[PDB]
Amino acid sequence: MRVVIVGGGFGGIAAASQLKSWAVPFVLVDMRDAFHHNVAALRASVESGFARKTFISYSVTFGDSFRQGKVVGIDPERQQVLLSDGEELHYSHLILATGSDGPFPGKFNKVIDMESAIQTYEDMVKEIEKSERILVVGGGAAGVEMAAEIKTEYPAKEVTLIHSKIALADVELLQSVRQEVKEILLRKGVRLLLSEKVSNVENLTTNQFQKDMVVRTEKGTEVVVDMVVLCTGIKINSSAYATAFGDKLASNGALNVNKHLQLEGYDNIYAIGDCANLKEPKMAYHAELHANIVVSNIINSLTHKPLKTYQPGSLTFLLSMGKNDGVGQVKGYYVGHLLVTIAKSRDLFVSKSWKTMGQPMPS
């Protein structure tokens, strides 16, 4: 028997770690040879020396249970995972944990080695350093984070953020929250260009210092900057499984699962993390909760016992998450509950990934 995990993200490494703890045979597959703590990728593209903390070697943790490769197909009938180098991996159980993909710096999902990936982010750090004026394209989570991280490291730089909507950040967020994102950026001094769409975006020179670049919008508006960072358009990564289940995907590319996180047509394929079509926000935190359920259900499948149900609204959230302030912001109420915001821990929980991987953080 063999559990194959496609995707070594937050979900995948949680599932692999747990399968190893249970001594279930498995192979974890990822394009990269290192786990990417992608939440901290924007900080890594700004703050010198930080990128080394955001990649963690898979093989050091998992040895022969890790296999680097780019999955270009899944055959659910013969139970094969098909790689871009022609090899095929049979499975008895398949966990799809393929996450979301988008432009660098926000995402870095490609076939690359750890040192080269760290050096790609370090190169970006020097380009940022060189540039007095920087445009960020995209007002979603990655763009807001990039604007904020630049102004944190370099409070005197001129940062402009352009965004096609009326308000920043994900529509599913409370507008009270969207407006607060605007106000957080304005407090840091970022200049906002909302409802404002870059024209001929494909001709931009990105991730590079270049004096006096002129960026035009569809409104004819112009700004002159020394570097352009693309933070538009993170979408669920269906590359592994599109040819097998494309006709059955949700609109956004996510996989439809039952209450046990099994794919609807199968009892031995599961989806976790962003790529599962759940009615919950796509977070690293939930990807890990999904992994617990799926590993439990693989165990129960071996033992012919009843499967566990994924309960959204897990109560396992404590002061450990967030900071130690104990402070919050009341944002609303409803039956039995209050809505609150708390500050993220400003290490962006990097240390938890090194803990999960059983590796000391770099010196």
Ligand X SMILES: Cc1cc2nc3c(=O)[nH]c(=O)nc-3n(C[C@H](O)[C@H](O)[C@H](O)COP(=O)(O)OP(=O)(O)OC[C@H]3O[C@@H](n4cnc5c(N)ncnc54)[C@H](O)[C@@H]3O)c2cc1C
At 335 the three-state DSSP class reads coil
**With contacts defined by CB under 8 A, how many residues of the chain interact with a copy of itself?**
52
Q: Which stretch binds ligand X (CB under 6 A): 45-53, 276-284, 303-311, 350-358?
A: 276-284
* Maximum CA extent, the chain: 66
Q: Is the dihedral of CA 2, 236, 289, 12 positive or negative?
A: positive
Chain centroid to CA 362: 22
In angstroms, what is the minimal distance from the CB of 87 to ligand X? 13
Q: Is 98 in the site for ligand X (CB under 6 A)?
A: yes
Contacts of 107 (CB under 8 A, 6+ apart): 38, 41, 100, 101, 142, 234
In angstroms, what is the minimal distance from the CB of 204 to a copy of itself? 24
Q: Is 264 in the site for a copy of itself (CB under 8 A)?
A: no
Neighbours of 230 (CB within 10 A): 22
61 touches, from ligand X, a copy of itself, none (C-beta below 5 to 8 Å by class)? none
- Identify the DSSP state of 314: -
Q: Is 72 in the site for a copy of itself (CB under 8 A)?
A: no
- Please pick, from the candidates 92, 210, 341, 359, the single residue that binds a copy of itself as defined by CB under 8 A: 341
Q: Is 344 in the site for ligand X (CB under 6 A)?
A: yes
- Please pick, from the candidates 17, 18, 38, 120, the single residue that binds ligand X as defined by CB under 6 A: 38
Neighbours of 246 (CB within 10 A): 10
Report residue 150 as tokens. Answer: 């630049």
Angle at 171 between CA 291 and CA 204, to 5 degrees: 95
In angstroms, what is the minimal distance from the CB of 343 to a copy of itself? 6
279 touches, from ligand X, a copy of itself, none (C-beta below 5 to 8 Å by class)? a copy of itself
Q: Which of 219, 230, 212 is nearest to 193 (CA)?
A: 219
In angstroms, what is the minimal distance from the CB of 110 to ligand X? 8
Q: Is 43 in the site for ligand X (CB under 6 A)?
A: no
Q: Is 187 in the site for a copy of itself (CB under 8 A)?
A: no
Query: What is the rounded CA–CA span in Å between residue 350 and residue 36?
Result: 10
Report residue 244 as tokens. Answer: 């097998």
Beta carbon nearer to a copy of itself, 61 or 100: 100
- Identify the DSSP state of 67: E
Q: Is 329 in the site for a copy of itself (CB under 8 A)?
A: yes
Query: What is the rounded CA–CA span in Å between residue 169 and residue 182?
Result: 9
Beta carbon nearer to a copy of itself, 84 or 176: 176
Please report, as a single letter, which amino acid is at residue 344: K
Query: What is the rounded CA–CA span in Å between residue 268 and residue 260?
Result: 11
- Please pick, from the candidates 5, 16, 26, 36, the single residue that binds ligand X as defined by CB under 6 A: 36
In angstroms, what is the minimal distance from the CB of 38 to a copy of itself? 13
- Please pick, from the candidates 265, 328, 358, 362, the single residue that binds a copy of itself as defined by CB under 8 A: 328
Q: Which stretch binds ligand X (CB under 6 A): 91-99, 119-127, 187-195, 248-256?
A: 91-99
Q: What is the DSSP string of 185-232?
A: HHHHTPEEEES--BSSGGG---SS--TTEEEEBTTS-EEEESEEEE--
Q: Which DSSP helix (H) or strand (E) runs through 137?
A: strand 133-137
Q: Which DSSP helix (H) or strand (E) runs through 90?
A: strand 88-90
- Please pick, from the candidates 21, 337, 360, 363, the single residue that binds a copy of itself as defined by CB under 8 A: 337
Q: Is 93 in the site for ligand X (CB under 6 A)?
A: no
In angstroms, what is the minimal distance from the CB of 126 to a copy of itself? 24
Beta carbon nearer to ligand X, 267 or 280: 280
Site residues (CB under 6 A) for ligand X? 6-12, 29-32, 36, 38-39, 42, 70-71, 97-100, 106, 109, 141-142, 145, 234, 237, 239-240, 273-275, 282-285, 287, 333, 344
